[PDB]
Design a protein around this ligand. Sequence first.
Ligand SMILES: O=C(N[C@H](CO)[C@H](O)c1ccc([N+](=O)[O-])cc1)C(Cl)Cl
Length: 123
Amino acid sequence: VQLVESGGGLVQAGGSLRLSCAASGRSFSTYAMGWFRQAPGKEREFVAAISWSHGITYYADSVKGRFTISRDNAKNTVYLQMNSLKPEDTAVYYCAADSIPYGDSRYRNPGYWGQGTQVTVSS
Ligand SMILES: O=C(N[C@H](CO)[C@H](O)c1ccc([N+](=O)[O-])cc1)C(Cl)Cl
């Protein structure tokens, strides 16, 4: 099983990116999925999550109104649309999958982690 992030890059402040997390080896349609980030010299932090259940999403306060998480089960892919990017959004972004299917919104150590994609937002 592998999660692979793509869609990172270097963008002017105020611009947008769309990150993709493509899963292989297993359908994750029954699993909640999440995006996290780690800025240089800082700890990993939650960005957004999307349930297996239609329409249920969660966002860190710092990205509310700017980022949107979505998923496409036919492509086995989760997306992070990132609008109104700020220099403080510069980080490696990681996608992850819940440790169990059909989970609630309580904290669990994610069961699978990707290797990350770099996002750099210029001045
Ligand atoms: O983001 C995730 N887990 C967070 C960690 O804070 C939390 O455990 C969670 C799990 C499920 C969920 N959901 O079903 O929408 C939301 C958050 C995993 Cl889905 Cl990768």
